[PDB]
Design a protein around this nucleic acid. Structure first.
Lengths: 182, 58, 181, 119, 74, 138
RNA sequence: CCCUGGUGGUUAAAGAAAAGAGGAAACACCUGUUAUCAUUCCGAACACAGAAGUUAAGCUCUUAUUCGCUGAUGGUACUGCGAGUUCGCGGGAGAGUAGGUUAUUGCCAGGG
């Protein structure tokens, strides 16, 4: 059995058809779809505190399911007293089935558990179908336990879509039921 | 891939206590309790107090 | 009509020294190109050119006669030495005498406007206007008197009184050439 | 758009570097290049002193009726060896042609090897 | 207040040693250079310091492709 | 004064300046120009003396454009020294002008007043000059 | 012979963007990760297993030259030489302008 995420089932069985009708696309897979979700977290303070970076990496692992990579400093800078090549950030890429499952978990479970959650700004679009927005308190995810955290942390989420514009991606996200603050 | 650096992903059923909706979602969280999903499949059941359709926003 | 005619004769010298000798003989080397023809190399009388076209602009058009043919040519270029007031080459771009064509033509402002007299502000929005005519009838520059233009008045493009066979070509007919606010 | 274009560009860069690392082929020891489509598998032997294809083979050839598996390319390499021996060429230089020497190409090359062709 | 500077190295005598069309035999030096001002074409080789030398007897020739100069022996 | 605010190198070699002008030899921003009839160097300070003269003569009538900027150091050894050490030190700045450089351009005023003002300017420069109207407009 | 795919030579943008046409074959997108392989995480690339679907994209052809690139003829700068001196002879730009330019070609395979 090729086990399939419920999001993938929902997409393939409805969303393709509604978007074809709604945007008069000539051929079927002109329809937008999702290629990757990038979860990033920038801990510049890790240059003092290694525990911060280790905790962030581990907590990302529990949140998603796959291990993270610690990015390095592209340039040595003094304003943040950064030496080139130091560990400064940590990111995870989600693709395919894991991507769909994570996005489902997020939208239905973790966005609800945010303090004063009143939707998400439906305008954080880079003009090319890529939607990036932040979450300040990782504790919204029930996966991580409260006691073991060493410092409350946030993280940025970027969703990359095959769409050529923002309208297409916003329509796809709305069909997915993404709680945009509107 | 190589296989030694990943937490154990598991299929999990999340149950809303309020609306009763259940979500099938592959969570790394091991739940002590087991539930028979609609599909006759056993899944670790985690009960979550707040979910999608029971938004104070939707 | 003569004052738009220019006498030339062909040259076959083609050298720096040769051109210097010609200009010593008080003529001007010149070339004519356009209409896909072979370039024509010729020479012009400097005194005649000075007398007739002492005020030549990019939009001046004239007639070249080699005794055997007539050509309608724009003064595409003229290599002038300012210190010695010396022309030392002319480029003539030929056009078809009967083909309507466009060209930006500058404006010339005359009169003292009542609005500016009384406290108006000149703002010359447009320094030129796109007109349309056969080559021989293109206006050298289009005149505009501001005297009746009072305060808070802009000049419409149609308001420009135009020579006979010259016609406006601007897409925006209602744009303002000069305003007095 | 740009992503497919850059994938193409990377493939071309690899191909070019491989070519001038292995050098050109001569009638004595010509060059064997391969191409791996989504459906088929192509091989050509080229003499660059002429720009001529001395011999060639691919899974499109109906008579062979091979597939696109390791087994099939093993048999295809066997056929290529027997076709080249009758044209008495035993030394070849192996242009991997922008691919990585692994899997299908590994089996192809080793099959040419077990039957007396110097690659 | 004397001069702060005045210091120059020995000239290294770079440049093309055999002109295009000349006949060379194997091993001749053709160009001495820092960097591939001229690149290598057929039948020549490049030393560890980018010297151009002839792998076989022949006649030097320079070609130009996309603005880069190539040296060959034909 | 008029002087560059930053230089790659503080001192540069005095070339030989010769030939007429093949560029910057046409009236561009104005109505009347002050061409030179020689090839020489115009210091920044003579430049600003001529500029004062023109501007002061013009009672707000129009605008003045300066078509040369000095950017060339002129070094001079200390007063009493010998020929020893080398390349003494920048003293003042020079601009290069060749026969046919427009050098100065004026807008707005009547031609008579412009001619007067610009002879008043020419009285303070080290080169012969000529006042030119556009010679292709009026 | 031609279309397509692959592989050489001839180096002038043989360049990108926008719009239209097709897709039989071929090619590409596309399917699944479970088999060997790869990723400083990620079947994205690559690797392997296959053919449900498509011209949407890549690709091919046709487009205004919209951007770029290339480029006349003259003239000028500059230059060799001269018992002609701002000259006499020889060579001759760059830039600008009239324009032009979205290649061509050798041979391997499939079949029109």
């Amino acid at each position: 059995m090729n086990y399939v995420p419920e999001l993938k089932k929902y997409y393939k069985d409805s969303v393709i058809k509604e978007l074809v009708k709604e945007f008069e696309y000539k051929s079927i897979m002109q329809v937008p779809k999702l290629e990757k979700i990038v979860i990033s977290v920038g801990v510049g303070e890790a240059v003092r505190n290694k525990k911060l970076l280790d905790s962030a990496v581990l907590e990302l692992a529990q949140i998603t399911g796959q291990k993270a990579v610690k990015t390095k400093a592209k340039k040595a800078i003094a304003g943040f007293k950064i030496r080139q090549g130091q560990e400064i950030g940590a990111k995870v890429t989600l693709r395919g089935n894991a991507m769909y499952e994570f996005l489902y978990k997020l939208i239905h479970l973790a966005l609800p558990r945010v303090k004063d959650f009143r939707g998400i700004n439906g305008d954080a679009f880079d003009g090319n179908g890529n939607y990036s927005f932040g979450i300040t308190e990782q504790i919204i995810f029930s996966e991580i336990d409260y006691d073991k955290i060493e410092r409350i942390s946030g993280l940025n989420i970027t969703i990359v879509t095959t769409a050529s514009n923002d309208k297409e991606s916003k329509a796809l996200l709305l069909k997915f039921g993404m709680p945009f603050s509107n | 891939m190589r296989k030694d650096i990943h937490p154990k992903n598991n299929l999990v059923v999340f149950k809303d206590g309020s609306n009763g909706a259940m979500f099938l979602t592959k969570s790394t969280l091991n739940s002590k309790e087991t539930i028979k999903y609609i599909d006759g499949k056993e899944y670790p059941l985690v009960t979550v107090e707040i979910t999608s359709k029971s938004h104070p926003f939707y | 009509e003569n004052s738009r005619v220019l006498s030339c004769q062909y040259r076959s010298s083609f050298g720096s020294s040769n051109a210097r000798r010609i200009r010593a003989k008080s003529e001007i080397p010149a070339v004519v190109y356009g209409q896909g023809k072979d370039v024509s190399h010729l020479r012009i009388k400097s005194s005649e050119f000075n007398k007739k076209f002492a005020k030549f602009t990019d939009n001046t058009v004239l007639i070249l006669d080699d005794g055997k043919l007539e050509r309608c040519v724009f003064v595409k270029d003229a290599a002038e030495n300012i210190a010695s007031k010396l022309i030392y080459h002319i480029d003539f771009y030929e056009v078809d005498r009967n083909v309507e064509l466009e060209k930006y033509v500058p404006i010339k402002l005359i009169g003292a406007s009542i609005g500016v007299k009384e406290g108006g502000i000149l703002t010359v929005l447009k320094e030129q206007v796109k007109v349309r005519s056969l080559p021989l009838d293109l206006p050298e520059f289009i005149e505009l008197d501001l005297t009746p233009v009072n305060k808070g008045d802009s000049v419409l493009l149609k308001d420009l009184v135009l020579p006979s066979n010259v016609r406006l070509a601007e897409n925006d007919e209602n744009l303002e050439v000069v305003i007095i606010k | 758009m740009k992503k497919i274009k850059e994938a193409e560009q990377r493939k071309l860069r690899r191909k070019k570097r491989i070519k001038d690392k292995i050098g050109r082929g001569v009638a004595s020891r010509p060059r064997i290049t391969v191409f791996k489509s989504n459906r088929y598998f192509y091989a050509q032997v080229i003499d660059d002193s002429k720009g001529h294809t001395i011999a060639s083979i691919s899974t499109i050839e109906k008579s062979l009726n091979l597939g696109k598996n390791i087994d099939d390319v093993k048999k295809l390499g066997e056929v290529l060896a027997k076709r080249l021996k009758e044209k008495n060429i035993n030394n070849l230089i192996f242009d991997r042609n922008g691919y990585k020497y692994h899997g299908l190409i590994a089996s192809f090359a080793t099959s040419l090897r077990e039957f007396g062709i110097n690659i | 207040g004397s001069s702060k500077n005045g210091r120059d190295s020995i000239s290294k005598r770079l440049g093309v040693k055999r002109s295009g069309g000349q006949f060379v035999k194997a091993g001749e030096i053709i160009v001495r250079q820092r960097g591939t001002k001229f690149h290598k074409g057929k039948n020549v080789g490049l030393g560890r310091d980018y010297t151009i030398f002839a792998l076989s007897s022949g006649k030097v020739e320079f070609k130009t492709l996309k603005g880069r100069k190539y040296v060959s022996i034909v | 004064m008029l002087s560059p605010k930053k230089v790659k190198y503080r001192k540069k070699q005095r070339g030989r300046l010769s030939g007429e002008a093949q560029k910057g030899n046409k009236i561009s921003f104005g109505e009347y120009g002050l061409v030179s009839l020689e090839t020489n160097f115009i210091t920044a300070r003579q430049i600003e003396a001529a500029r004062i003269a023109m501007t002061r003569k013009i009672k707000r009538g129009g605008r003045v454009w300066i078509r040369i900027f000095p950017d060339i150091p002129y070094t001079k050894k200390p007063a009493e020294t010998r020929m020893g050490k080398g390349k003494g030190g920048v003293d003042h700045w020079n601009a290069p002008v060749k026969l046919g450089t427009v050098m100065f351009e004026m807008s707005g005023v009547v031609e008579e007043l412009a001619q007067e003002a610009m002879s008043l300017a020419s009285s303070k420069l080290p080169v012969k000059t000529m006042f030119v109207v556009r010679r292709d407009l009026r």
